[PDB]
Ligand binder design. Structure first.
Ligand SMILES: [Mg+2]
Lengths: 204, 144, 50, 98, 510, 190
């Protein structure tokens, strides 16, 4: 009722007197319902799971990032094509691409203790290789070039970079019932639900 | 028909390339992309160097699109590193450095191209049609 | 080799939360407070006003 | 058994579709007996894919019966060109590939 | 006076705001505090921190920058309406009327061919909305363009679309005059407000005592000019989160570089000056001939486009005072190493152009194998991604006792796409292995079934009335409760409709 | 068709006497009114329904009449919205609006029935928390604040109960004890 009243009030504010079909208000309502979003439980106390919002940077101990595949992030928005501002850029202009490219740095610098980054490297259907976003790629390249693993002093810069980048990338299993998950190590699962299936102890 | 040479291919007018099985057409595509980015080839070269957004690639499937995009990014990064170091082991990059007049300007251009990889105009046919209809809604008459 | 899943010695607590009077008292409202922050939740259960 | 299925329906109404299938498989050891049976790995992968698809569909549906109707409609007429409906790889092990 | 506070972390700026509020307080209790934020979560966090420190947080307003500027316009300048006649919403309904009359003109011929196809006025409404959005963006960022278009002249060296955009706007400026609505808008108000504030001998009444801007890292230049004009009368405190300590913005001219070198930032509480550049003598070497500075760190150079323009515009303020709240970051971890590299404006990445530099790797910093500050994870599907994230969060909680669920944040590119997998994975977790979660920023339309159902009811006139659709309408519980239909009765109704012969259509008229 | 009645329904609300003083909504100026004030209240220690009910029952007879409270242990922030805060003759008040349909007739909106209505919906804890919030706010904002000098009480206004002929109907006025507010503040603090 509030959205309907707001639409009709914005229409009456301009003193539009011509007849209006129902489909117009229906589409307007369907679009405004999609535009509105809910954020009342952002800091309720449970873990926060939401999207990256521009100009919102809050310090957190653990900052995790999901869905950083190539073509998914940064989110792209194209100009109308008849926007005179887009043709001649000027200082102070705002574009969504730069907004996301700066949100990534905000999320990088906001992490106080731990930063987590995840992306889809392999397709589940065809087992084909997928690539991450350009920002994550630049970050991992800088991390590899900047640091070296112990005992790698003898080697050259490229081998040390490759070895360091291999040390931070963790490839998990394809299925949750894979036995490799239930082994002592970094990726040992806390879900004992698939433990019986992994032990392959069952009756046909 | 003429035996194709990526370095000497004239990037003018309409060209048809036949790549038999096992020839590795993706390698030739990446070499031509690097040439178009750097404007190498002399008379065969394009009159002006083009940016990443200007270059257009059409692929058959989404998986091939992502594969070609990633390989182009990797080749751009390797060529930039080679231009910076001025010594590369790969023969194609060596021939490219041979053709390049100034390696620092080429390295700067390759750095900008690598930083503009997310905006690469590598699409499928449907995505290309959708984007061309969206960018030109007035001429095409399609809804926004 | 033998396969054993990890166990949680410590259980995460849900004690800390931001609440309102309506959520603290009225359980039937559910997520009505989330949709409208300033909704008059004091009056609920409409009757026949034919 | 009726009380058990009523609890399953409560879990479906409260948490969702896949949280109910997860509990149903865990209570009756479906995945274990399937993996024990010859050729059950393909069936288990298909069950998991269908559960994921059912969750994605019920997310955007009005009622719970609407999800059953959607599943029945997709079953009666299936689409092969859709990329989402494509069957996943049966196993990641090194085997003879057809 | 206008004061700009620089700090790498937001907590120091929040503590400075708390200190400022504690030192001086508003005389009247009904007078609400003013804080400028663009996002709602930022206001929530500010309220929570202020309530935790002071013990309460009430009578605090968080208006948008544009709304605050318009409120100041209404307060200072006389005879100004509360709501602007030129806005995104009203301009759409005004252009929807204005366009058919202007279609006959030659200048709009390109638009004419576009409006011939539609018969239900969808193209007209979409074009009106898309034009009102660009008109609002021009009101915000390009006031001179509209000021020139109103008179009738064209801007030299602009796009070709101006040919059809310049008259239309002018017609709008005329059309709103015919209806009797107020002529005033933002572009006209800017210069008059600035002149009125500059020529004022004393502060005009009704202005707030002090204004706080926080969390906003991007502001329009005209808004910054208005804030500089307003700071002379009322105190304004800008809390800007600056990732780099030194000045990393570009310069306009060498004459600007000189007065930039003259400028220095004073310490917050130690009363010691600090230069903007690390080396004042070699500061001109960094900047290029065009005026674009080369940032020392590659990550800050690549991702710093947005903050660069903002810090360059903040440095332009003449009467602004600047202070430094920066806190050093000790490089004891990989994430701390990267943050210190970003802060100190240094590049530790080795290029390897030299043979000796390429041969050895001792130049790089040593990494600890047990260190897990920054980790990258490869998954096959979003379901597997969330299933791995859950175990990782459980391991992190077991590792650190002080860590709490509220401290952890998880951000996804598309919240709607991952919401089903998030809900399924977090709900399938058992009692003992449970983690309380909360999802935000989800679309409101998908929140409740009733919203979706109503949208379908709006499409009643253009409907074929299939039986399954009418039955799915009954599947909704509230709708069935309205007509007193139960589930047991719904089964009999389904059977009777199936066997009776109802296929489609409600009557012969349909 | 609701125009002629509702207008009158508004006037009877504006020209009604809230309390013994005779202060009215119409008299209040724009500078003396604050509408829809939002407040966040921190809870440092866990809150137990049993101890809070034991503390509240002795000071307030309405709470003594009500059955004991029941809610889970909570520790965190408390969010609240206040309808109206106004000061008269240097003394601050609290005003809340209630649009609840108590009954179909005027007899259901009497003072005795309004007491049972407040008992049923447990509005007593609501106005007690609102008084705690307003007390903390006036203590923080005002340099020289005393609870006895600057507090006037709580007013609940049932819009439908308000009648021009009957002054008592539609208004409920009650001021919590100072000791109860102090003990609640000490409980919320530590
Ligand atoms: Mg009320």
């Amino acid at each position: 009722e509030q959205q309907w009243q707001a639409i009709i009030a914005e229409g009456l504010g301009a003193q539009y007197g011509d007849a209006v079909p129902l489909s117009l208000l229906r589409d307007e309502l369907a679009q405004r319902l999609d535009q509105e979003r809910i954020s009342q439980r952002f800091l309720a106390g449970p873990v926060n799971i939401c999207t990256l919002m521009p100009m919102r940077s809050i310090p957190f101990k653990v900052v995790c990032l999901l869905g950083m595949n190539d073509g998914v992030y940064p989110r792209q928005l194209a100009p109308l094509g008849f926007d005179l501002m887009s043709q001649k850029p000027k200082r102070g202009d705002r574009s969504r691409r730069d907004d996301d490219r700066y949100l990534f740095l905000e999320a990088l610098i906001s992490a106080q203790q731990k930063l987590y980054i995840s992306y889809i490297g392999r397709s589940i259907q065809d087992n084909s290789e997928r690539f991450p976003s350009v920002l994550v790629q630049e970050l991992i390249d800088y991390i590899g070039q900047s640091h070296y693993l112990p005992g790698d002093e003898a080697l050259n810069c490229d081998e040390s970079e490759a070895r360091v980048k291999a040390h931070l990338t963790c490839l998990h299993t394809r299925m949750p019932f894979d036995p490799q998950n239930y082994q002592p190590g970094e990726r040992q699962s806390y879900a004992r639900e698939w433990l019986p299936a992994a032990s392959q102890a069952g009756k046909a | 028909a003429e035996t194709l040479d990526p370095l000497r291919l004239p990037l003018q007018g309409e060209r048809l390339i036949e790549a038999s099985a096992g020839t590795g057409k993706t390698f030739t595509i990446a070499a031509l992309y690097l040439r178009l980015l750097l404007g190498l080839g002399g008379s065969a070269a394009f009159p002006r160097p083009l940016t990443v957004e200007e270059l257009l690639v059409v692929t058959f499937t989404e998986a091939a699109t992502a594969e070609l995009r990633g390989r182009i990014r990797s080749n751009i990064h390797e060529l930039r590193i080679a231009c910076l170091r001025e010594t590369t082991d790969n023969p194609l990059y060596e021939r490219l450095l041979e053709e390049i007049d100034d390696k620092a300007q080429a390295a700067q251009w390759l750095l900008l191209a690598e930083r503009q990889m997310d905006e690469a105009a590598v699409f499928t046919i449907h995505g290309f049609c959708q984007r061309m209809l969206n960018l030109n809604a007035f001429e095409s008459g399609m809804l926004f | 080799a033998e396969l054993n899943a990890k166990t949680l010695q410590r259980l995460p607590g849900d004690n800390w939360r931001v609440t309102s009077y309506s959520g603290l008292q009225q359980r039937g409202h559910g997520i009505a407070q989330d949709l409208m922050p300033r909704l008059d939740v004091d009056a609920a259960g409409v009757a026949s006003v034919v | 058994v009726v009380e058990e299925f009523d609890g399953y329906r409560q879990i479906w109404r409260k948490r969702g579709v896949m949280p109910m299938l997860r509990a149903l498989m865990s209570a009756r050891n479906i995945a274990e007996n399937l993996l024990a049976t010859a050729g059950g790995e393909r069936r288990l992968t298909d069950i998991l894919h269908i559960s994921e698809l059912l969750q994605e569909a019920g997310t955007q549906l009005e009622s719970e019966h609407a999800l059953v109707r959607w599943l029945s409609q997709h079953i009666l007429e299936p689409d092969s060109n859709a990329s989402s409906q494509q069957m996943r790889l049966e196993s990641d092990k090194h085997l003879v590939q057809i | 006076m206008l004061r700009v506070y620089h700090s790498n972390r937001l907590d120091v700026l929040e503590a400075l705001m708390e200190f400022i509020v504690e030192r001086e307080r508003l005389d009247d209790p009904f007078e609400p505090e003013m804080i400028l934020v663009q996002s709602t979560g930022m206001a929530q966090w500010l309220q929570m921190t202020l309530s935790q420190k002071f013990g309460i947080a009430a009578n605090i307003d968080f208006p948008l920058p544009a709304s605050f500027i318009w409120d100041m316009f209404v307060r200072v300048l006389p005879e100004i309406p509360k709501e602007s006649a030129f806005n995104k919403q009203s301009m759409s309904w005004k252009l929807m009327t204005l366009l058919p009359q202007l279609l006959e003109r030659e200048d709009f011929t390109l638009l004419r061919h576009y409006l011939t196809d539609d018969s239900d006025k969808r193209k007209l409404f979409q074009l009106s909305s898309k034009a009102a959005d660009l008109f609002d963006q021009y009101l915000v960022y390009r006031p001179d363009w509209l000021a020139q278009w109103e008179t009738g002249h064209l801007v030299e060296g602009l796009g070709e679309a101006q040919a059809w955009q310049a008259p239309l706007w002018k017609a709008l400026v005329e059309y709103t005059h015919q209806l009797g609505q107020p002529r005033w808008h933002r572009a006209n108000l800017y210069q008059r407000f600035i002149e009125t504030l500059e020529s004022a001998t004393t502060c005009p009444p009704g202005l707030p005592s002090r204004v706080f801007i926080c969390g906003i890292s991007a502001l329009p230049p005209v808004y910054l000019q208005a804030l500089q004009a307003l700071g002379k009368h009322i105190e304004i405190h800008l809390l800007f989160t600056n990732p780099c300590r030194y000045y990393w913005g570009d310069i306009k001219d060498p004459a600007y570089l000189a007065k930039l070198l003259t400028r220095q930032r004073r310490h917050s509480f130690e009363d010691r000056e600090l230069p903007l550049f690390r080396d004042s003598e070699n500061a001109g070497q960094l900047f290029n001939s065009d005026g674009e500075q080369d940032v020392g760190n590659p990550l800050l150079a690549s991702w710093g486009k947005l903050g660069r323009d903002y810090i360059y515009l903040l440095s332009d303020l003449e009467s602004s005072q600047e202070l430094d709240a920066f806190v050093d970051v000790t490089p004891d971890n990989l994430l701390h190493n990267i943050q210190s590299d970003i802060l100190e404006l240094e590049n530790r990445a080795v290029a390897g152009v030299n043979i000796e530099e390429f041969s050895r790797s001792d130049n790089k910093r040593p990494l600890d194998p047990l260190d897990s500050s920054i980790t990258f994870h490869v998954c096959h599907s979003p379901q597997r991604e969330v299933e791995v994230l859950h175990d990782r969060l459980l391991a992190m909680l077991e590792e650190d006792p002080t860590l709490t669920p509220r401290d952890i944040i998880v951000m996804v590119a598309d919240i709607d796409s991952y919401s089903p997998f998030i809900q399924a994975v977090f709900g399938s977790a058992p009692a003992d292995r449970y983690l309380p979660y909360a999802i935000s920023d989800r679309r409101a339309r998908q929140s409740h079934p009733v919203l979706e159902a109503f949208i379908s009811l709006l499409s009643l006139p253009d409907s074929r009335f299939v039986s399954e659709d009418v039955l799915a309408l009954l599947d909704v519980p509230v709708l069935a409760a309205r007509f007193d239909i139960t589930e047991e009765g719904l089964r009999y109704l389904r059977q009777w409709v199936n066997e009776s012969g109802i296929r489609w259509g409600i009557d012969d008229d349909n | 068709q609701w125009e002629p009645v509702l207008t009158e329904w508004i006037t009877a609300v504006l020209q009604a006497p809230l309390n013994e003083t005779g202060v009215s909504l119409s008299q209040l100026s724009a500078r003396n009114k604050q509408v829809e004030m939002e407040f966040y209240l921190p809870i440092s220690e866990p809150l137990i329904a049993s101890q809070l009910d034991t503390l509240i029952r002795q000071f307030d007879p309405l709470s003594a009449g009500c059955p004991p409270l029941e809610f889970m242990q909570v520790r965190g922030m408390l969010k609240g919205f206040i309808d109206l805060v106004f000061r008269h003759e240097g003394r601050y008040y609290l005003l809340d609006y209630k649009s609840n349909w108590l009954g179909e007739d005027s007899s259901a909106y009497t003072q005795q029935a309004m007491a049972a209505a407040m008992q049923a919906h447990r509005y007593d804890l609501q106005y007690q928390l609102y008084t705690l919030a307003l007390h903390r706010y006036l203590r923080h904002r005002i340099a020289d604040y005393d609870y006895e000098h600057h507090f006037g009480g709580v007013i609940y206004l049932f819009l439908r109960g308000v009648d021009k002929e009957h002054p008592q109907q539609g208004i409920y006025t009650t001021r919590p004890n100072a000791g109860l507010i102090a003990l609640m503040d000490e409980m919320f603090a530590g």
